[PDB]
Amino acid sequence: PRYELALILKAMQRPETAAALKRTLEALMDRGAVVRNLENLGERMLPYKISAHNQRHSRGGYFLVDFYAPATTVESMMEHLSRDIDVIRPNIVKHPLTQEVKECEGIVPVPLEEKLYSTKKR
Amino acid sequence: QEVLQLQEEAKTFITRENLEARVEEALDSPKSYNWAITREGLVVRPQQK
Amino acid sequence: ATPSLRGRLARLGNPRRPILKPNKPLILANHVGERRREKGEATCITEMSVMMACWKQN
Amino acid sequence: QDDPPPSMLLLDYQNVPGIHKVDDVVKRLLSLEMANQKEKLKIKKMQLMNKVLENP
Amino acid sequence: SNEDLPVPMENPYKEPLKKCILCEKHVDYKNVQLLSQFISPFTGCIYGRHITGLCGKKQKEITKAIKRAQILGFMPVTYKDPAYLKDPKVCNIKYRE
Amino acid sequence: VESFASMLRHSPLTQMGPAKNKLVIGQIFHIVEDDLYIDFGGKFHCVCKRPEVDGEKYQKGTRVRLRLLDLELTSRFLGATTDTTILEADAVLLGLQES
Amino acid sequence: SSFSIYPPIPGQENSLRWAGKKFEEIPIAHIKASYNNTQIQVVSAAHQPLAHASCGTEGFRNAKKGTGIAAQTAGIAAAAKATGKGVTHVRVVVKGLGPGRLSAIKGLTMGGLEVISITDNTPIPHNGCRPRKARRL
Amino acid sequence: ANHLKFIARTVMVQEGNVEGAYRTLNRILTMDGLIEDIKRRRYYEKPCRRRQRESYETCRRIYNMEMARKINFLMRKNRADPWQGC
RNA sequence: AGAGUUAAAUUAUAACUAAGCUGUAAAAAGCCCUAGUUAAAAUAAAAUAACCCACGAAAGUGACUCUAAUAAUCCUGACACACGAUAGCUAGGACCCAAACUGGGAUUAGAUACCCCACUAUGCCUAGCCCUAAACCCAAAUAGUUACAUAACAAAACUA
Ligand SMILES: [Mg+2]
Ligand SMILES: [Mg+2]
Ligand SMILES: [Mg+2]
Ligand SMILES: [Mg+2]
Ligand SMILES: [Mg+2]
Ligand SMILES: [Mg+2]
Ligand SMILES: [Mg+2]
Ligand SMILES: [Mg+2]
Ligand SMILES: [Mg+2]
Ligand SMILES: [Mg+2]
Ligand SMILES: [Mg+2]
Ligand SMILES: [Mg+2]
Ligand SMILES: [Mg+2]
Ligand SMILES: [Mg+2]
Ligand SMILES: [Mg+2]
Ligand SMILES: [Mg+2]
Ligand SMILES: [Mg+2]
Ligand SMILES: [Mg+2]
Ligand SMILES: [Mg+2]
Ligand SMILES: [Zn+2]
């Protein structure tokens, strides 16, 4: 997976939410995207009140869209999602599953530094 | 191995047809990425609630 | 644990630039310091204010 | 200015067998379409070293 | 021709190296629980190494993750989310004495 | 005749390897009020506190059981050329020579 | 006895009442403690001002009103005017780090008023506006 | 401001004793440096002054740490001496 | 280097409530179109992490996201070429807050200072200049050695 779209949607009923998700996904496929998956993180009360589109929002729905897109297009998508009034806040991140975990082999302990000063007898 | 891997993954992707279905499906199944650790280096998961 | 001393000070070998500029050399002295006597503050001020309110009233 | 075509199927995936039999989608994810800029640079490097040189 | 002389082998007794609680885990900005473990409940501050006790790599990772999750709107900045208060305490700080 | 190498290879201290967490037998050659100065036979004596259970059973010449932590307590400190020897060993007094 | 230092989140079922009210329904005593002065205002949970007392309101003057004695006096005065409007309990919010912090708090206690929670909200910029220059160049 | 009120930097008083509660609070704030930062931000400190302060503080910490370490390492030998008047 | 974004403050601005608020070692002057609480754009700046020691040639760089990207099969080398903190200059835009200047208030023998209040150039953005710093880690670059050997102090001594 290449990009990860973190989507925070206005908290709404079933049909309208499905609607927004649909037109958003379409909007993605239109900029040339291939959508791998859609996940739902549920609706929660937001960490802090978010002001967007002349509305101050308390709650919201959370979604992940993993997808492949040409490098060029991210900006484009962003623009779109900015002017959508049903989106509380967009973000697009290089997918966490592209970066792979190197091995902590342990903690190499650091010896106390030596020869910082001369052998002078005070 | 990589080409065949993606060959398999590709079967699952969302397309113009799968749109309504996969959307209505994902609306039904909340997932959590949440987990905690213990001082021992052990993973603790919430789903046991 | 002690904050690392590696690559911190300016030395002829060291590749990078100084982090710590020690005022006096870091060497453990053979004595410690003398405890700093506590700064005194006014005592009984609460009971005083109570008494002064009592007086102003009566 | 040269043009390393959007479908050109990036350098590491060109010599793996039976690639062209794969469906359009996977072929597209391995295209210079979904690629980085550094991929186009790998390709350009290869093409140039082949055009110009004797022993690539 | 003495066979009782020592052999130039590496140390057999040498212990394994100790590990950050997270050595070969994956820190993800998306999970607010693991992150808010390393935050001060009352303030929302991020604890340092001397507190969390991590390899530099993982202290970095936790930090970057926390910041990202904070601005993307996953996790609150000024306090630990109450929901996560009673989770396991891995940090070495004692406020109440 | 025995080569020094031969002796060293087979000696009980060589057999022990790393001195951490080792069960050792040691003898009390000196006493101060609560302090038992114990020669366990390696190099330095260790010093243990007299336990509350059977306190008077510990006397000069008594034998005891120890858990050895460190053969010699030593560390290097800020701005020093060599380490700092406490001229002791580090041990835990378990009980006395169950027999 | 299980006692949590942490307060009662609103969405929780948690039952604790002071004179029957929820933690949220309790009035709030705002104490602004600044180096030259201390202001106290008791307010409804609905943010309707009940009572106002300050070290200036209390008839001190310039330097004098900085001190902790003055803060205590203002705290007592505030608690009086507030209990006059019948507030039994209060949640303290302390804004600022100054001479009159603790004095004004226990001056609220001394003034016949009950403190349940004590919060510190002190402005802490994560680097906003540059503050004025240091004294003694 | 946009966060929920009363969840942070808040202590509940126990059994009506306010002084101990405030003490707990102040210990919290001091623990997290919040007090030192409140105090330091009253006047602007120019970046080089800051840099200097940080370097000095770290040196100080290194020395204190190391001294406390030699203290606790040497603490055993404070016992009454065996060989007195040898 | 681009483009997009904003958590904590702060402020225009209302709504209640209070007559004071601000300011010092202490006051005065200032402000009461003020103050506390509840609402809030723009602007600017980037707590904690950082007890870390990374990136860049240096200057520099530590809120978030993405795009682009960190010369040389790696000796030295200019007056040639390209950069270069802060301040400063030109033109347009921004202005929360800070603040040379200046005007008030104290202080003082004086006070064209230190302390207090107010406000400006300026700090910010775009484009172009200017080319200096205790631009100092006062330690040239590249390879090495720990041999001989302490002017003093400091960051030990040396070879090519
Ligand atoms: Mg460098
Ligand atoms: Mg000096
Ligand atoms: Mg000067
Ligand atoms: Mg620009
Ligand atoms: Mg804000
Ligand atoms: Mg404006
Ligand atoms: Mg006046
Ligand atoms: Mg910040
Ligand atoms: Mg290079
Ligand atoms: Mg050269
Ligand atoms: Mg310049
Ligand atoms: Mg201009
Ligand atoms: Mg201006
Ligand atoms: Mg000013
Ligand atoms: Mg004047
Ligand atoms: Mg300029
Ligand atoms: Mg410099
Ligand atoms: Mg020079
Ligand atoms: Mg040179
Ligand atoms: Zn690790």
UniProtKB/TrEMBL annotation, chain D:
It is found in: Mitochondrion. It comes from the Eukaryota. Belongs to the universal ribosomal protein uS15 family. This is Small ribosomal subunit protein uS15m. The lineage of its organism: Eukaryota, Metazoa, Chordata, Craniata, Vertebrata. The gene is MRPS15. The chain holds residues 65 to 120 of 266 of the full protein.
UniProtKB/TrEMBL annotation, chain E:
One of its GO terms (biological process) is translation. It is found in: Mitochondrion. The keyword Repeat does not apply. GO terms for cellular component: mitochondrial inner membrane; mitochondrial small ribosomal subunit. This is Small ribosomal subunit protein bS18m. GO terms for molecular function: small ribosomal subunit rRNA binding; structural constituent of ribosome. Its main location: mitochondrion. The keyword Iron applies. Zn(2+) binds at C20, C23, C55. It comes from the Eukaryota. [2Fe-2S] cluster binds at C20, C23, C55. Belongs to the bacterial ribosomal protein bS18 family. Keywords: 2Fe-2S, Iron, Iron-sulfur, Metal-binding, Mitochondrion, Ribonucleoprotein, Ribosomal protein, Transit peptide, Zinc. The chain holds residues 47 to 143 of 143 of the full protein.
TrEMBL record, chain F:
It comes from Sus scrofa. The chain holds residues 78 to 176 of 188 of the full protein. This is 28S ribosomal protein S28, mitochondrial. GO terms for cellular component: mitochondrial small ribosomal subunit. One of its GO terms (biological process) is mitochondrial translation. Keywords: Ribonucleoprotein, Ribosomal protein.
UniProtKB/TrEMBL annotation, chain H:
Coiled coil: none annotated. One of its GO terms (molecular function) is structural constituent of ribosome. The keyword Ribosomal protein applies. The modification N-acetylalanine is found at A1. Keywords: Ribonucleoprotein, Ribosomal protein. It holds the Pfam family Ribosomal_S21. GO terms for biological process: translation. InterPro entries: Ribosomal_bS21 (IPR001911), Ribosomal_bS21_sf (IPR038380). PANTHER family: MITOCHONDRIAL 28S RIBOSOMAL PROTEIN S21, SMALL RIBOSOMAL SUBUNIT PROTEIN BS21M. This is 28S ribosomal protein S21, mitochondrial. It comes from Sus scrofa (Pig).
